[PDB]
A paper describes a structure:
The human KCTD family contains 25 soluble proteins that share a conserved potassium (K+) Channel Tetramerization Domain (a subtype of ‘BTB domain’) at their N-termini and have variable C-termini. The BTB fold of the Kv and KCTD families has a roughly pyramidal wedge shape and consists of five α-helices and a single β-sheet made from three β-strands. Here, we present novel X-ray crystal structures of the BTB domains of a further five members of the KCTD family and examine the stoichiometry and stability of their multimeric assemblies in solution. Overall, the pyramidal wedge shape of the KCTD family BTB domain creates a versatile scaffold compatible with a range of oligomeric assemblies and geometries that may impact function.
Residue numbers in the entry: 17 to 50, 55 to 85, 92 to 120
The structure:
């Protein structure tokens, strides 16, 4: 049961599950999977992959581990955006 989704994000390859990409509703991925594919049949995402790895690992693990915030906003990853903004609030000295 389930579906394996292969992604090509600006030339860097990732493989994940449909579940991982769709637990956040109304996101970029929600729409994407409701498209452009490369030679290999992977879904192509025309974005810099530099911070995609930490985005993907958040979607997998539901825990964290700025450009990350900006990409999370682009992809419409609501809880990640929130937790990143609150991380900033936590650090405030004024």
């Amino acid at each position: 049961m389930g579906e394996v989704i292969h992604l090509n994000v600006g030339g860097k390859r990732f493989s994940t599950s449909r579940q991982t990409l769709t637990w956040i509703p109304d996101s970029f991925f929600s729409s994407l999977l409701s498209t452009l594919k490369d030679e290999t049949g992977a879904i192509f995402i025309d974005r810099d992959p530099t911070v995609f790895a930490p985005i993907l690992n958040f979607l997998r693990t539901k825990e964290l581990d700025s450009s990350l915030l900006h990409e999370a906003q682009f992809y419409g990853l609501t809880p990640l955006v929130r937790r990143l903004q609150l991380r900033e609030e936590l650090d405030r000295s004024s």
